């Protein structure tokens, strides 16, 4: 479909039974979700953002169904403001920026 | 043109005789630019980000030529690690997220 940036670009995700809403972000190299209970072994990485660095938990091989398109990528769990579906998942779902 | 998100969508911007590169960012409601000397008056505003918060200069009605497309909107100047062309300008040049 096409979205049409007059509204913030939100899509729904299904990540391990938890139905949460997430933003498609073109200027986010990674996807970070807040509030989800994610289960297993994790490698701790530190991410950057603007005036910010937060320790995310890097969990690999997590299936996330983004708006009814599936992608098995890497999701970071953290105290983020809005949930992000960044480039690492956007590529799998075939997302393109156009003008 | 349609940008593939396998590589960061960095576009060239022309803002007041200063040529620079900027990120095409759907997850930012406002466009922020680092310390590029801009002329005029500025209104207080400080915005929400991941990790924290930064104070900017609400500069309304300044022109920015993004990929040779002219747009005029509110640009913010400040402690940004990286440059952003956010939603308030993104829809003026005609940008859509397709999938
Ligand atoms: C979030 C995640 C996202 N940040 C990133 O993707 C940033 C880059 C960026 C910052 C700010 C604006 C644009 C781009 C990159 C990732 O956080 C970092 C890069 C990094 C990590 C540690 C120290 C220094 C750099 N890389 C990363 O998380 O892992 C990968 C999987 C890409 C190897 C963001 N924050 C604010 C706007 N976009
Ligand atoms: C910067 C600025 C930009 N931040 C915003 O757009 C943030 C939201 C956001 C944060 C983190 C990740 C995604 C989205 C919202 C803007 O700061 C604010 C909303 C707000 C401000 C202060 C307190 C509470 C809410 N909105 C905004 O600036 O745009 C309008 C047009 C509404 C004035 C950003 N986007 C992604 C990372 N940083």
Curated annotation (Swiss-Prot), chains A, B:
**Region ranges (Dimerization of protease):** 1-5, 49-55, 88-99
- The active-site annotation reads 25 (for protease activity)
Chain ranges of the Peptidase A2 domain: 20-89
Instruction: Note the subunit structure.
Output: Homodimer, whose active site consists of two apposed aspartic acid residues.
Role this protein plays: Aspartyl protease that mediates proteolytic cleavages of Gag and Gag-Pol polyproteins during or shortly after the release of the virion from the plasma membrane. Cleavages take place as an ordered, step-wise cascade to yield mature proteins. This process is called maturation. Displays maximal activity during the budding process just prior to particle release from the cell. Also cleaves Nef and Vif, probably concomitantly with viral structural proteins on maturation of virus particles. Hydrolyzes host EIF4GI and PABP1 in order to shut off the capped cellular mRNA translation.
- State what protein this is by name: Protease
Q: Which gene encodes it?
A: gag-pol
């Amino acid at each position: 479909p096409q979205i049409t940036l007059w509204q913030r670009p939100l899509v729904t995700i299904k990540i391990g039974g938890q139905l949460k809403e997430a933003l498609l972000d073109t200027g986010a190299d990674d996807s970070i979700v807040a509030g989800i209970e994610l289960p297993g072994r994790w490698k701790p990485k530190m991410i950057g953002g603007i005036g910010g660095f937060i320790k995310v938990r890097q969990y690999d091989q997590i299936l996330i169904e983004i708006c009814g398109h599936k992608a098995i990528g890497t999701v970071l769990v953290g105290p983020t403001p809005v949930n992000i579906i960044g480039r690492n998942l956007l590529t799998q779902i075939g997302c393109t920026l156009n003008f």
